[PDB]
Amino acid sequence: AGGNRLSNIHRHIEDTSLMEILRRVYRSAQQFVTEPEMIRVSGAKLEVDPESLNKEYSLEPIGADFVTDATKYVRQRMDFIAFASQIPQMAERLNYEALLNDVVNHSGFDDPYSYIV
Amino acid sequence: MIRIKDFNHVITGREQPLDINEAIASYITSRYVYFKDARRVAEETWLEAWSLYSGTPEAVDHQRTQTINTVGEVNNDWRHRLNTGKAYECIETVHGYLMGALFPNREWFDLTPNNPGYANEARIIRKYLTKKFNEGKFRVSFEKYLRQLLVCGYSVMALPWRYESRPYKYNVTIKREENEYYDNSTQKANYRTVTENRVTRNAPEFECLDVFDVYLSPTSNDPNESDFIRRIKKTRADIITAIKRGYYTDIDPYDIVNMSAYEVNDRVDKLTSFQGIETNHPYCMDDIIEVVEYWGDLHLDGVSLYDVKATVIGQTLVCCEPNPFWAGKPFVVGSITELPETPYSVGLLQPNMGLLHQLNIITNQRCDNLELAIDEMWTLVQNSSLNPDEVQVAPGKVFLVDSHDDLRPIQRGGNNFVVSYQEAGLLESTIDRNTGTGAGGNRLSNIHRHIEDTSLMEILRRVYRSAQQFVTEPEMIRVSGAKLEVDPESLNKEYSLEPIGADFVTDATKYVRQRMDFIAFASQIPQMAERLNYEALLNDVVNHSGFDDPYSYIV
Amino acid sequence: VSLYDVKATVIGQTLVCCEPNPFWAGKPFVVGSITELPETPYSVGLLQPN
Amino acid sequence: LFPNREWFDLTPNNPGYANEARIIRKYLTKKFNEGKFRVSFEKYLRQLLVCGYSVMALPWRYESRPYKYNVTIKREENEYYDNSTQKANYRTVTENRVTRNAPEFECLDVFDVYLSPTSNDPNESDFIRRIKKTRADIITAIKRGYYTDID
Amino acid sequence: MIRIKDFNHVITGREQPLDINEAIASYITSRYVYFKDARRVAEETWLEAWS
């Protein structure tokens, strides 16, 4: 009822204002911020054109539900591994390399590959 | 003179028309006039539904002009111009439920290939469509589209790869700013001049079109296969660009300046006045021209052309060609409650519009009577001592009179407001009970299923077919995360994809669960456990587990 | 002549700046709406119907 | 909209751009924290709810770009003032500072922002803005060469 | 005199305006006036909502 109405309004506002602001901000940052300035502002240790900016250096902004999306992504793999590992003939036939790589990359860490030897 | 053999044509007579361009222009004009004339009552119903939905003094003024037709010979000249917002809240509740059902999460659609050997291409096309939808702001356009559909019972959406929506390159010469910080020696003339290749569009990829500007055939029963007539606002700059590109051929670039100006529809004017913006112009930018765009069949005198796109500027045919889209016209028509003889359906308001008007009338009449029923009044009779300038209320005031009955409060009669309140409550209950916003879940699920099957899935079908037709392998790989000769015949049979909504997760879960249960039953007994094709079982499970690159998980 | 996607600055009936849009993402202004109508850029607020 | 301070994420379309996506996300988070984005968004949303229409101006506008300057000041190198504390004996220094003349994120007024009446997309319409700009800012713009046709 | 070739431009007529700066200034002023005048009722609605 009221929750439904407010959820619809929140969806519309997030899709129209917040995501548009995010899009404008990161595209302007990509246009105007250099590599040394960016790594010096942020915690860390560039030639583009408008055509390629929409093609390969494109980012898609999402709200606070990224934790839920990553949780679903990781849970799909965990359920698949749990089903496959119980049966020996299929347990030997999994690519744990790719499985662990996807899990660590979508586990929500800031430096995920630092946890892989 | 268009080449008739270039079209899907049927020779219906011995003599073909002399000048096919004027013949087609006259046919299109006559069809447009007929479509406008046969839809007169429906447009009035849509406009009064919009007036009921929107709450403004102008909307109330428009509503009070329709109550004679809708409710009947009743009095509606109350000095109260209040609106209850009942239609507004019904539309918003249904809209919120439908948004929640149609886009519950970000993976709201899936493309299942019909040929199992087309899975990689299906996944790549799905990623391309997700990127396309995110870039084209599809959700906002679909929100407008659904609001219009729920209010009017009929809506239209234009999809990308239209001529006005194709992106184009251009050159810009600009002063590039290289430093974040401005110093005391900051001069703009000393900046490096840079010529940049930029890409832009002149029209949105996904657009919600106006029902007062989109016309369908009155005798057609399938809205998506009906003849399509659209009125387009195109600038002289756009027409010059089209002529230079060669899309418009029979019109003069320096006569389009003297070409007739755009005329705004009266219904659109009233709809905008409802919001409070005067689209009526002291000047209309002096730049907008009316364009008549026709999709469908031309039944002329001596020849009939099938599935054509035509463009007319005024009374002259500037474009005429076979439909360049293999999936049909890039316009999707959406309906709520389809009737067996009309292409326009019934909206959520239309069954309840008389009740909405009656509720507004009852509320206004009750307010008019109540404003008079509240005031406390007194009566003073002539006497010798109590003057009318001494009769005022004070705590404990003593009136020095000669008779106790000189000043007396006025006794008001019994007010008949309880019946008005009861009838207003009954009307509100009836409106919520007819709309389905209470059962109610069943009504909303039926509406959601119809909308998903009619509008969203048709949009998905047309968009992925147009992507397969117009998008090349290299740019598709560039757009999607990844590391082509087809024809309309094979397109529907081997390279065919089935679009489904958010229930693909449930489908994959069921598909995996059947195999899981079968394996669990078979593995408990050694005699049957040794006869299982684990290669096939694992392959199907990993392919239907919902991964993006499922074969990367198999050694 | 028709110019597309330009930034212009005017100080009292004189044009003091006119250039192509220097932003690849479009203008740095974001317009927010609540209930978008099919023919208006201005939407419906929460107080407007009431 | 803001249940926690990790209220947004940037997912790259190309899987080879994940590191740069993370750097851009961190840069955007720090910029949002510094530019007082939340208060501006509260004002923006309040205006949007009241009117049904609101406008927000984002950074990298000319009036919001940072600039450097020099100031000559007396640094206080001692924590406690004694009976022989004299400001004239302090160390005179010239410090290089950075600042802005306009906020990076600003909620604009709907009575000062105008759009095209016949446009359907509010974010793709013609934009007209009325700006209160000081003569000092106009002098700075003319000196920097951004304004060329006024004295 | 701004350079037209620097813009995303479309030539719509045979004769370009004599003074492009004044032409653009007049166009912007007319557009501002039109936008302000076409929005008078909505501005009343907004001020009423604020009140």
Asked if B144 reaches chain C (Cβ–Cβ under 8 Å), the answer is yes
**Contacts with B236 from chain C: Cβ below 8 Å:** 2
- Partner-chain contact B139 A15, CB within 8 Å: yes
User: Which chains share 3+ C-beta pairs under 8 angstroms with D?
Assistant: A, B, C, E
Check if the beta carbon of residue D94 is closer than 8 Å to that of residue D30: no
> Most C CBs within 10 Å: which of A9, A28, A46, A58, as the mutation test of the C interface?
A28
- Partner-chain contact B240 E7, CB within 8 Å: no
- Taking the C-alpha atoms of residue D117 and residue B281, their distance in angstroms, rounded to an integer, is 10
Question: E30 to chain D: nearest residue by CA?
Answer: D128
Give phi and psi for A42, each to the nearest 5.
-95, 170
Q: Which two tokens stand for residue B199?
A: 């890409």
3-class SS of residue D115: strand
Asked if A90 reaches chain D (Cβ–Cβ under 8 Å), the answer is no
Provide the 8-state DSSP code for B413: P
* Residue listed under structure tokens 């239907």: B544
Helices (H), B452-533: 457-470, 473-479, 488-491, 504-523, 526-529
- Taking the C-alpha atoms of residue B269 and residue C39, their distance in angstroms, rounded to an integer, is 9
Size of the A and B interface in Cβ pairs below 8 Å: 86
Asked if B188 reaches chain D (Cβ–Cβ under 8 Å), the answer is yes
Asked if E43 reaches chain C (Cβ–Cβ under 8 Å), the answer is no
- Partner-chain contact D11 A56, CB within 8 Å: no
Question: B345-362 as b/e, with b when 16 or more CB fall inside 10 Å?
Answer: bbbbbbebbebbbbbbbb
**Contacts with C43 from chain A: Cβ below 8 Å:** none
Asked if D117 reaches chain B (Cβ–Cβ under 8 Å), the answer is yes
CA distances from C47 to B407, D46, D51 (A): 46, 12, 7
* Residue listed under structure tokens 């906002």: B140
Check if the beta carbon of residue B155 is closer than 8 Å to that of residue B334: yes
Q: Percent helix, strand, coil in chain A (nearest 5)?
A: 70, 5, 25
3-class SS of residue B185: coil
> Most B CBs within 10 Å: which of C39, C43, C46, C47, as the mutation test of the B interface?
C39
Nearest-CA distance B183 → chain D (Å): 5
Question: A7-27 as b/e, with b when 16 or more CB fall inside 10 Å?
Answer: ebbebbbbbbbbbbbbbbbbb
Nearest-CA distance D150 → chain E (Å): 12
Of B200, B272, B275, the CB nearest to C5: B200
Pairing state between β A59-62 and B154-158: unpaired
* Residue listed under structure tokens 């009136």: B399
Provide the 8-state DSSP code for B412: P
Pairing state between β D91-99 and D113-115: unpaired
Nearest-CA distance C19 → chain B (Å): 7
User: Which chains share 3+ C-beta pairs under 8 angstroms with C?
Assistant: A, B, D, E
Asked if E30 reaches chain C (Cβ–Cβ under 8 Å), the answer is no
Nearest-CA distance C38 → chain B (Å): 6
CA distances from B167 to B170, B203, B470, B499 (A): 10, 9, 13, 26
DSSP symbols for B115-151:
SGGGHHHHHHHHHHHHHHHHHTTHHHHHHHHHHHHHH
Nearest-CA distance D15 → chain C (Å): 22
The helix (run of H) or strand (run of E) holding residue B105 is none
Would you call C18 exposed, middle or buried from its count of C-beta atoms within 10 A (0-12, 13-18, 19+)?
buried
Would you call E15 exposed, middle or buried from its count of C-beta atoms within 10 A (0-12, 13-18, 19+)?
exposed
- Partner-chain contact B553 A16, CB within 8 Å: no
Give phi and psi for D24, each to the nearest 5.
-65, -40
Nearest-CA distance D44 → chain A (Å): 10
Bin A95: left if φ > 0, else alpha if -120 < ψ < 50, else beta.
beta
- HSE at residue B388, side-chain half, CA atoms within 13 A, is 5
- Partner-chain contact D149 E36, CB within 8 Å: no
Check if the beta carbon of residue B537 is closer than 8 Å to that of residue B529: no
3-class SS of residue E17: coil
Q: Which two tokens stand for residue B469?
A: 């037709």
Entry field: residues in chain B: 555
- Taking the C-alpha atoms of residue B348 and residue B335, their distance in angstroms, rounded to an integer, is 11
Nearest-CA distance D11 → chain A (Å): 5
- Taking the C-alpha atoms of residue A9 and residue D25, their distance in angstroms, rounded to an integer, is 26
Provide the 8-state DSSP code for B337: B
* Dihedral angle sign, alpha carbons of residues B541, B543, B547, B549: positive
Asked if B57 reaches chain E (Cβ–Cβ under 8 Å), the answer is no
Portion 5-24 of C in contact with D at CB < 8 A:
9, 11, 14-17, 23
- Taking the C-alpha atoms of residue B529 and residue B538, their distance in angstroms, rounded to an integer, is 15
- Taking the C-alpha atoms of residue B441 and residue B24, their distance in angstroms, rounded to an integer, is 50
The helix (run of H) or strand (run of E) holding residue B380 is strand B378-380
Of D11, D28, D123, the CB nearest to A62: D11
Resolution (A): 2.6
CA dihedral D97, D101, D104, D105 (to 10 degrees): 140
Asked if C30 reaches chain A (Cβ–Cβ under 8 Å), the answer is yes
**Contacts with E44 from chain D: Cβ below 8 Å:** none
B226: how many CB neighbours lie within 10 A of its CB?
21
Entry field: residues in chain A: 117
Question: E40 to chain D: nearest residue by CA?
Answer: D111
Of B140, B174, B277, the CB nearest to C19: B174
- Taking the C-alpha atoms of residue A37 and residue A30, their distance in angstroms, rounded to an integer, is 11
What is the amino acid identity at position B464? Y
Helices (H), B471-503: 473-479, 488-491
List the one residue out of B128, B377, B302, D82 whose CA is nearest residue A55: B128
> Most A CBs within 10 Å: which of C24, C31, C35, C46, as the mutation test of the A interface?
C24
Size of the B and D interface in Cβ pairs below 8 Å: 42
3-class SS of residue D70: strand
Nearest-CA distance E32 → chain D (Å): 7
Q: Do chains A and E touch (3 or more CB pairs under 8 A)?
A: no
- Taking the C-alpha atoms of residue E36 and residue E43, their distance in angstroms, rounded to an integer, is 9
> Most E CBs within 10 Å: which of B169, B174, B273, B277, as the mutation test of the E interface?
B277
Contacts of B65 (CB under 8 A, 6+ apart): none
Provide the 8-state DSSP code for B306: E
CA distances from B193 to B172, B196, B246, C8, E20 (A): 10, 10, 33, 19, 22
Contacts of B470 (CB under 8 A, 6+ apart): B161
- Partner-chain contact C30 A21, CB within 8 Å: yes
Check if the beta carbon of residue B16 is closer than 8 Å to that of residue B312: no
Give phi and psi for B239, each to the nearest 5.
-70, -40
The helix (run of H) or strand (run of E) holding residue B326 is none
**Contacts with C23 from chain A: Cβ below 8 Å:** 24, 27-28, 31
